[model samples]
Each structure stands twice: as structure tokens, then as C-alpha cells.
Target: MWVYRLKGTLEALDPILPGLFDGGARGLWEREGEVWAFFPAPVDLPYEGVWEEVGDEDWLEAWRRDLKPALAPPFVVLAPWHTWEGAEIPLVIEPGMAFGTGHHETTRLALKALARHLRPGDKVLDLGTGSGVLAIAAEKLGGKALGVDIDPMVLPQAEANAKRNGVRPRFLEGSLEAALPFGPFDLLVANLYAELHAALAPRYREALVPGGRALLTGILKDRAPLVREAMAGAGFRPLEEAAEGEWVLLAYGR
Candidate 1:
């Protein structure tokens, strides 16, 4: 993987972001005061030597080397390639194409929110459960978690992670609608696109039992108002919220 630090903040990167987004740039975000872009392929950008070869690994695993363990009080997110000795609750995830490695602020926000709302024996549903991080965290907190994702390819990764963490969660490979048959859950965590959140707002309420809670994230900070309105309109009552960088994480009661 190649790491390129653009010469400005997100404000400066936004105008030329289209040029960076193409050619399989894995992900881009602001780290520290500069904007960093990760590209799996050889990069030849005109950034005056800001770009350099970080390592030769898959885009997923490459970031793991520099990724320190992310902490959320009692829970910690780590890559299977490394371990944390003092983690109160260690979550081991193998790097993959699916998101949610917990390095991103979005994932941390979700985990922190989950830590606060989870209750023992609660039936928790994780929507778009990339890497199964949230579901595993829920189970570690004593909830029975069921993870649902649209991509079938992530099944092995999620299952392996559960085993590594010594937690067993039912991982379903299908749409949110497909997982509904098994639900009536006490809690749900859906870290997904803003548009999906809007479209699935009503169904999310239907999937949970009365007064069930939800942790909704993967929303850009600027889009929070629209998504919040959509959820409120669909009968979900707003609760606490967390923000990091330019991402927003929201909690709601159904």
C-alpha cells in the first residue's frame, strides 16, 4: 500500500478529491492536520514527494501495521495480526475489503455508543456488519448479537473474527430485509450509507421489539440533519450522539 499525505486539510482536499477517488484508492480521510489517501496501486500524484511507499501488502492489511489499538473504555479493537495485552475486551478482526476495522472514527463512535446502551442478554442486530466488529463487541458486553451484511464474501472473515475473540455470533449474509425474519431484536446497530439509513428507517423500527435501541452511523457530518429527520419521521426517537472528525454517530430508541 502507498500512503500519500496531501498538502492541506480536508477543506483543501475536497476540491481535488475527484482525482484521488478514482483508480481504487482504498480510503481517504484527515489524520492529524493533513489529509492522507491510501492507494493500493502505484501512485504518481504531483504532491512534491508527499507520497511514499508505505509497504507492499493488501490495502486492508497494510494499514494494520501503523494502526494502534483503538480503545473504547472496556472494549478494544485490534487486528488479528497483532494483540493488545491490557485490553479490557479485545476484539480481533482480520483486515479485509469490508469496512469497520475500528480505526475509523465512525467505528469507534458506534462501539462507544454500543458500550453505553447494551444490556445483558439483549438480542442485538448488526446491519451492514462489516468485519462483525460491532456484533462481536455487543456479545462481549453480554448481548446475543446477530450480524447481517449484504456481501457473502465477508462471511469467513466475520466468523474467523468471532472465533478469535472467543465469541459466537450468528452472521447472516443477505440484505437487511432478509435478516428481519429472525428478528424482533432488543437493539440494532446499522453503520451504513445515509441514503440506506433513510430508506430503511421504517423497516429498522419493524425489526426491533418495543422500545428497542439503535446505533446509526456511517453518516457524513454534513448529512446528519437529513438522516436524523428521516429517522425521526419513521418513528425512532432521538437519543445521544457522538461525533469525531467529520463523521457523526447517532443513537435512537425505537
Candidate 2:
């Protein structure tokens, strides 16, 4: 395997991470102070990074061994092979190229928010589901969840993860527009960027029932005001707010 090493954290490289994947990066790993992208062979990339060759087994084994289960109150996100002795609800997900392996701060924040807001038998819309961790969490918390993503390739991965956890959250291809037909949901959880959330605020109101909750994250602390103002304009009342690292999750009632 060829490794493309960049001197920064994953958050620091967020702007170019998508380009790295599109340029044929098979997987990404973050170490102490650097981000590593793995590929089968060296490819042309615009970013400045050092390339090194290593055995495929060596990289895979090390990555799997280094990964730790993520805990967010009542839920614990685990890799399929991991076993936990704690009493937290287990969400066994396969770590794949899809986003949301429960390793990111936003993912944990969303999971925590879901636990805090979701009621039994509530309908949940997990927009931009990624690995479907949030949707699975919603189901485990007794909500009926439907996860939607713009990327078709990730739907299969999300479904597989849901199956691993022994929960069946519906997975679909497309974004919020495609999810609206499945609503009006009792809860809408979106782990997308601040600007996107702001743009979708009015539509979010349309996707949910009266007084339904919206659990939103994937926002940087500095960009939260954009989302807050938009949600307010859309007639959503702020219910709760939580922060993890530089990320923030805002809960609102529509």
C-alpha cells in the first residue's frame, strides 16, 4: 500500500479530505500530529504530502488495533469485532471508507443528542447518514430511523453497519429533499455543515411535524451563529446545546 502522509490533524485537512478520497485514497487514518491516506498505488494529487510504501496487512492490522470504541452516554459505538463489558447500548459498525465511524466529534455529539431527544416510536430522519451510526442509534433508542445520504455508495455501507448492529434503519440515496417524502418525521437529525444547515432550515421545518425536534451538528463553534439565526427564522425554538472540542450540536423544536 502507498501512504500519503500530511502534517496535520483530520480537522485541519478537512477542506482537502474529500479530494483525497476522490483521488483514489482507499482509507484515511489520523495519528498523533499527522493524517495518513492509503492507496493501492501512487497517484497525482495537488496537495503537498510525503508518500511512503508499506505492507497492506501492516497498515490494516495497525489501524484496526489502534481504533477504540466511542462512548456517548447510553450508546457505545463499536467496531464489529469489538466486545464491551459496559452496560451502554452497543452499536457495532464496520469501519469503512464512509464517514461517521463514531470517531469524529460530530458523530458522538449527534449520538448524545439523539439519546437526549428521541422518544420511543418516534420517526427519525438521519440526513447525511454516512455510516448510519446516528440512525442505528436512533433505532436502538426505540425510534424508527430512516437514513439518507447524497452519496449512493455509502448507502450500502450504512445498511451493512445497521445489520451488524442488529437494527434495521432504512438507508436511502439522496439528501434532505429525498428524505422529505418519508416525513413528517418526529425528529430530524442532520450531521452536515453549518452553511448547509442554515440553507436547509426552512425546508427542515417542512420535513417535521409540529413541535418536532431537530438535532443538528457538523458545525464549527465559530459558524454556529449562522445556523442559529437560520433556525430561528424558520420558526424553530432553541431547546438545548452541547459542545465537544470545536464542534457544537444544537437541538431545536420546530
Candidate 3:
């Protein structure tokens, strides 16, 4: 295995995150003062970083051992090997290349927001669904969910995750346009960056039914206005706002 070591915090490396993922980073970690991106092999990355070879088995073992269950009030995201005796709903997900293991604040925020906004039997859309965690959570909340992502590579992992949790939220290989046929949904949730959220605001309005709710996150605190302006222009009214660390989740009504 190869590790790309970048000398910065996760927040400092945020701008290049999408590029790193697109460049085939298998996983990311923040260690000490630097952020480490894992890859099967070294690939050309736009950012300046150092590469180091590491033992795959030892790394995977250590990572799994250190990974703790993520708590999101009504939901608790757990690895397949994890056991929870708490009252929170357990979502057994095998951590892999796809995002949303529930470790990220955005995922946890989205999960909590879903609990608040989602009604049982609501038709839901999980846009840019990585690892299918949110869609699975929607299903667990008694909503019919369809998870869509542009990256086809993540679909299989998402499907496996849904199965692991004993839910069957449909997984598709496209963005909002691909999910349109499944909608006029009652609720929509997306964990995408702010600029992308701004760009897709109009489509988000189009995908939902009248009075539908949208739970949007994966936005940096400083970029909240970008999403707010676009959402307002798209005819969505503010419902609620939540912040976790440097990330924020915006809830809106269409």
C-alpha cells in the first residue's frame, strides 16, 4: 500500500479533497499535524505530498481497531464486526473506499437531520450517496429511499452496505438527473460540497414534491452563504440549520 502524506490538517486539505478522491484515494486519515491519504499505488496528484510505502495488513488492522462507532442520536453507525447494546438504531457498514462510514461530521449531521425531517413512508432521494449510509438510514426510518451517485465504482459497495444493514434502498449510478424518475420525493438529502450544492439547487427543487424537505450538508462553515443564496433563489425556505465543527447542514422546505 502507498500513503500520500500531506502537511496539513483535514480542514487545510479540504480544497483538494474531491481531487484526491477522484484521483483514486482509497481512504483518508488525519494523523498528528498532517493528513494522510491511502492509495493502492502512487498516482499523480495536483497537491504537494510525500509518498511512503506501508504494510497493508498492519495498516488495515490498526485502522479497524481504532475506528469507533459513530453516534448520531437515533442512529449509530457501526462496522460489521462492531456490537452495540444501546437503544440507537444500528447501521452495520463495512468501511471501504466509498464515503459515509458515519465518521465524518456531515454524515452524522445528515443522519440526525433525517431523523428530524423524515416521516415514515416518505419517498426519499439520497443524492451523491456514498457508501449508501444515509439511504439505508432513511429506509430504517421507514422511508422509501433511492440513493444516486455519479461514481459507478461505489454502487456495489453501497449495495453491500445496504444488505449488511438489512435494508434495500435502491442504488443508482448517476446524479440528481438520474434520480428524477424515482422522485417527486418527499425528502432529499445530499452531502456534497457547497459550490456543487449551489449549482444543483434548481434541480433539487425539481426533484422534490411541493413542501418537500431538503437536508443538505458537506458544506464548510464559511461557504454556508453560497448554499443559502442558491437555495433561496431556487425557492426553498429555511427550515433549520446545524453546525458541527467546521461543517454545517442546512435544512430547507421546497
What number of clashing residue pairs does each candidate have, in the order they appear? 0, 0, 0
Question: Which is the winner by lDDT between candidate 1 and candidate 3?
Answer: 3
Q: Please give, for residues 63-114, the per-residue lDDT of candidate 3 as tens digits.
A: 6798888899899999988888999999998888787888888899999999
Model 3 misplaced regions, further than 4 Å? 1-57
The residue-by-residue lDDT of candidate 2 on 1-254, one tens digit each, is 89999966798899999999998998998863469999999998989898888665787677689899889889898898888999999988888878888888889999999998999999999999988999999999999999999889998889888888789889999988888888999999999889999999999999999979999998999999999999999999999899988889999997
Clash pairs (backbone) in predicted model 1: none
Q: For residues 1-254, write the lDDT of model 1, one tens digit per residue.
A: 77777644577577677777764578786643357787876666655527768765564345556778888767788776676789478888776656777777788888989989989999999998878899999999999999988888877888888898899999988977888888889999888867888888888889889989988998888888888988899889899888988788989997
**Candidate 2: which stretches are off by over 4 Å?**
1-57
* Structure candidate 3, residue pairs in collision: none
lDDT of prediction 2:
0.90
* TM-score of each prediction: 0.80, 0.81, 0.81
Worst 10 residues of 1 by lDDT: 55-64
Residue 116, candidate 1: C-alpha displacement in angstroms:
0.6
